[PDB]
């Protein structure tokens, strides 16, 4: 009851805006760095 239920937006915002950043940090390295390694391996074979 009362206005104590409105404070729940802190945890909703922290969860939504927190897990979104995690997908733009750890998954931004898995795709912008591992793809380079595969591309580097693809180019390494042609030169070798």
């Amino acid at each position: 009851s009362s206005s104590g239920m409105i404070v729940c937006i802190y945890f909703i915002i922290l969860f939504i805006c927190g897990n979104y950043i995690l997908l733009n940090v750890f998954l931004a390295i898995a795709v912008d760095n591992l793809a380079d390694a595969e591309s580097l391996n693809t180019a390494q074979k042609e030169e070798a």
Binding site: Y10, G18, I21, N24, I29, D32, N33, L34
Partner: protein, 158 residues
């Protein structure tokens, strides 16, 4: 001179040495028998000597300048420097009740002696090294986000 060090028979020997060194760490458990305790610390110094013998022999075969070229060789001498310090300090008048735990986790760092020759994902490691300015900046932005929400949560629910 340097034929033995770069020989293929030397490659297998150091692989074996890393194996039982790891086994001396992974065999430790709660309520372990006294005899197994006696094996671990005895073999801690024995494998230290063999690594030191491998350390001393390797140094007097190629030249100091070439060793510092390799990134791992500087790291490899770092571990053995703490390995000898561990035994001399333990047997000395320093009890260091927690110092055993931290040092035993340092000689575990030579397991990477076998992962330096994959040839299959070492190019991935090179990609994670020149992107440090991009990796660190993203990690710090996440840290600043956590710091702000931790201080905000101290006000509301402190």
């Amino acid at each position: 001179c340097r034929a033995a060090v770069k020989s293929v028979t030397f490659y297998w020997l150091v692989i074996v040495l890393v194996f039982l060194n790891t086994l001396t760490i992974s065999s430790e458990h709660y309520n372990q028998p006294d005899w197994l305790t006696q094996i671990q610390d005895i073999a801690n110094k024995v494998l230290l000597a063999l690594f030191t013998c491998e350390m001393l022999v390797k140094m007097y075969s190629l030249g100091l300048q070439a060793y510092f070229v390799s990134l791992f060789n500087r790291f490899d001498c770092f571990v053995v420097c703490g390995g000898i310090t561990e035994t001399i300090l333990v047997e000395l008048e320093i009890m260091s009740p927690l110092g055993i735990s931290v040092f035993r986790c340092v000689r575990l760092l030579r397991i990477f002696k076998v992962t330096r020759h994959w040839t299959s994902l070492s190019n991935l490691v090179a990609s994670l090294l020149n992107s440090m300015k991009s990796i660190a900046s993203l990690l710090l932005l996440l840290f600043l986000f956590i710091i702000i929400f931790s201080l905000l949560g101290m006000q509301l629910f402190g």
